[PDB]
Write a protein that binds this ligand. Structure first.
Ligand SMILES: *CCC(=O)Nc1ccc(OC)c(Nc2cc(-c3[nH]c(SC)nc3-c3ccc(F)cc3)ccn2)c1
Ligand SMILES: *CCC(=O)Nc1ccc(OC)c(Nc2cc(-c3[nH]c(SC)nc3-c3ccc(F)cc3)ccn2)c1
Ligand SMILES: [Cl-]
Ligand SMILES: [Cl-]
Lengths: 314, 301
């Protein structure tokens, strides 16, 4: 009901393009509330069009679901405007997406951050599973940085909302994240919590490689074949076997032998209490989590929502 | 807790726009840039007017630690300091500005629910300070900030004695004594500022004379939109006997009861349309701009 605000074009304006993806383009926007003199920064995503004649009531029905997620590590859909285009509004994250972030800070990112991000993504996915929601497009590009200490999963439900043609399954770099999908999703369009776990495995690989592209050079139309031959992403240079073993367990053919998200929370949290034993990174001692003074300052300005503490080295 | 006050360097922030001035200094909109990042985070900066020596900065710094230690949804927390030649204080930017200029700009477009809820929230904020045995000394409509129209916060705590006759209690004018009950006096003047949509108290009466007219029993007039039950509360805050003025705890309860029957205690033209936002609008505001936890506001019955 009340969790989702219906906007009109008169009360917001796209100000500047931030990025473009398969689901649409994201603009920095301004909400201009009824009868006020302020401009509030917002993020606006104008979606490309769904491959299905989507009734507005069922666009709104999906959006209410998206507006109902209440968890520190999943972004909640705040508003929608249904005109010629479908435009979604939510809180602007000035730090951008986690894939761009790890690429840009490749040389100054330590084990404590990498492992805590793992935990927080797993926490956000565990929430979705408890709500019986399947993301279908979990990836590092779909994790946003609210602060460097706080990441949140975005864009859930949009894969099932917009769908995709069958041509973009059998084609290179399109609207279907073939190289992030479990084999059963590629072959049969089967999407469960356990194939979200597969995508979580690929997401962790992106982070541990500081933003490498998975299976680069192998055409997307061939990924289904190499997966059935047993080929998987290689062990990132900074990962001990403990971390690589978890990754490979997520890419097992039999879905129900993959780990559960709740298990992944527990093991990545264990590893975050002694991060130097599980990731080998040069200069890792010259990189720490923020001090208490710095986290209190970050939170009071920009991140006031309830959140569990980051897992620190004992 | 020394970890509640960040010591800023000049290199990591910049003043962008002037937002206003005050008895204590000049207020800027600024941008904080964290080290190693490329983002620009808006902040409010207050630059004090007088320059200070190292010995004077030590007294300022320890007072700042107390300001940084206030934690309540209706009192603004001091977040940082930069000890230059001329001191600068940093807190979170309240984009809707100060309530004084807000009510002046929205004169005949503010419903009764907003006014009474602002009085509840201000009282809650002062009651927190009293509970911590902290005296504001400069409560006024210009020192209540608007985070959202539904959420206001007292600012500038502790600045007064660290470094407003027509807001002060008689005992403070005559003998420079400041107590929680003198804060209650200025609460009444603040409520008077709100109800007249930002009129100037005791207009055209020189500050040198306020002492003497108060002695003779002259008090600010009944605002036109106020029922006599609102005005009597205000009148109780301006009694010469400090301890028979209302207590901040009692004001929360009184205005909250009134906030549930808002149109019987304030009579406003066109009030049948200025209701506080639906749950939908209020959820939007909070997820977008105001994620801190705060008790619900008092809606009608
Ligand atoms: C990883 C790619 C990316 O999103 N980069 C990026 C660059 C600049 C930015 O502004 C500071 C942001 N902020 C941001 C983005 C989003 C968002 N990102 C995506 S990519 C799949 N999709 C969205 C989005 C926006 C609005 C909605 F209603 C739903 C989804 C969201 C908030 N802040 C990011
Ligand atoms: C009535 C005057 C006023 O404050 N106006 C105003 C106009 C625009 C604004 O943002 C768009 C804000 N936001 C704001 C103001 C302040 C602040 N006001 C004062 S008046 C004496 N003092 C402060 C302040 C700033 C920083 C500190 F560390 C302490 C006190 C604070 C936050 N947002 C206001
Ligand atoms: Cl996208
Ligand atoms: Cl001032």
């Amino acid at each position: 009901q009340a969790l989702l605000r219906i906007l009109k074009e008169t009360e917001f304006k796209k100000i500047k393009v931030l990025g473009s993806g398969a689901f649409g383009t994201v603009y920095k926007g301004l909400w201009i509330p009824e009868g006020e003199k302020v401009k509030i920064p917002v993020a606006i995503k104008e979606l490309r069009e769904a491959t299905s004649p989507k009734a507005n009531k069922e666009i709104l029905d999906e959006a209410y679901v998206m507006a109902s997620v209440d968890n520190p590590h999943v972004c909640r859909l705040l508003g929608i405007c249904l005109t010629s285009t479908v435009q979604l509004i939510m809180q602007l994250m000035p730090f951008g997406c986690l894939l761009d972030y790890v690429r840009e800070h490749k040389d100054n990112i330590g084990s404590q951050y990498l492992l805590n991000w793992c935990v927080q993504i797993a926490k956000g996915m565990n929430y979705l599973e408890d709500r019986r929601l399947v993301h279908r497009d979990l990836a590092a590009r779909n994790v946003l940085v609210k602060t460097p200490q706080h990441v949140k999963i975005t864009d859930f439900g949009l894969a099932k909302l917009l769908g995709a043609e069958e041509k973009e399954y059998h084609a290179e770099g399109g609207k279907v994240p073939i190289k992030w999908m479990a084999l059963e999703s590629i072959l049969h369009r089967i999407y469960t919590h356990q194939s979200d776990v597969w995508s979580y495995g690929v997401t962790v690989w992106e982070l541990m490689t500081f933003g490498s592209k998975p299976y680069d050079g192998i055409p997307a139309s061939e990924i289904s074949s190499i997966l059935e031959k047993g080929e998987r992403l290689p062990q990132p240079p900074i990962c001990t076997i403990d971390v690589y073993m978890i990754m490979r367990k997520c890419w097992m053919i039999d879905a129900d032998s993959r780990p559960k998200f709740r298990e992944l929370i527990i093991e990545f949290s264990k590893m975050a209490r002694d991060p130097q034993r599980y990731l080998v990174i040069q200069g890792d001692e010259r990189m720490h989590l923020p001090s208490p003074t710095d986290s209190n300052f970050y939170r009071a300005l920009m991140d006031e929502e309830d959140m569990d503490d980051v897992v620190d080295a004992d």
